[PDB]
Design a protein around this ligand. Structure first.
Ligand SMILES: [Zn+2]
Lengths: 48, 201
């Protein structure tokens, strides 16, 4: 039950049941970034 | 060099003196060219510093590129890059004009490209250029020290060697057609040896 979750379950895997009442709008997050330095123009990359 | 003071800064001057020490002529990197093996393209970059222009500019310290904009490796093409010659010299007050018993004064002159090896140490020289200051005389940051001032030198554009007695610079005179005609005429007389001999001292 949703009312039975507590400290012992933190960071473990759980299975829960209920009813969806609200979904939000889609957001954007980065998975690969190409960056540059605005002074010396040194370039690199980042991966998520 | 003795009578060159802070009131002549940023103005065009002409100085006389004796060359005391030159420097090794070095190349300066201006444009680099590279190659990417994964794409087959050639790239380049330009470089500049504070002594290549008379007016102050906002610095743009670009780095030397080793990679591509997409991460690929690059290869340097030394034959397609560009280098320019560079030298620095020192000029002192002439020994035949400086006061006796007094330590002398000197000034540095920077030359570039086609005026790079026009004199050797010990010559009497005349250099025309712009007397200019550079950097910050310990003003940026705290820099508690106050003894030093502003670095100064001459960005030269004209160098003239001068002939003197008992020096290594030889005298040469430009010969005009009037002179050539007169010489070739006098060559045809018969006492020319006598005339030329009696003229000495
Ligand atoms: Zn940077």
């Amino acid at each position: 039950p949703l009312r039975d979750l507590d400290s012992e379950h933190v960071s473990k895997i759980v299975r829960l049941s209920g009813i969806i009442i609200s979904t939000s709008v889609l957001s954007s997050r980065a998975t690969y970034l190409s960056i540059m330095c605005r002074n010396c123009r040194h370039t690199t990359s980042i991966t998520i | 060099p003795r009578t060159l003071t802070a009131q002549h800064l940023n103005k065009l001057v002409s100085v006389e003196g004796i060359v005391t020490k030159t420097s090794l002529v070095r190349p300066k990197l201006i444009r680099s060219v590279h190659y990417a093996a994964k794409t087959g393209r050639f790239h380049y970059r330009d470089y500049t510093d504070a002594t290549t222009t008379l007016t102050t500019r906002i610095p743009t310290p670009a780095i030397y590129p080793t990679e591509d904009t997409e991460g690929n490796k690059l290869t340097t093409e030394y034959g397609y890059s560009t280098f320019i010659d560079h030298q620095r010299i020192t000029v002192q007050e002439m020994p035949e004009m400086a006061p006796a018993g007094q330590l002398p004064r000197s000034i540095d002159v920077i030359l570039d490209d086609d005026l790079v090896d026009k004199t050797k140490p010990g010559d009497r020289v005349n250099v025309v250029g712009v007397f200019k200051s550079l950097g910050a005389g310990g003003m940026n940051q705290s820099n508690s020290n106050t003894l030093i001032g502003f670095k100064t030198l001459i960005l030269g554009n004209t160098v003239y060697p001068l002939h003197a007695r008992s020096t290594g610079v030889a005298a040469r005179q430009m010969l005009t057609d009037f002179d050539i005609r007169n010489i070739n005429k006098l060559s045809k007389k018969k006492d020319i040896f006598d005339i030329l001999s009696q003229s000495l001292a």
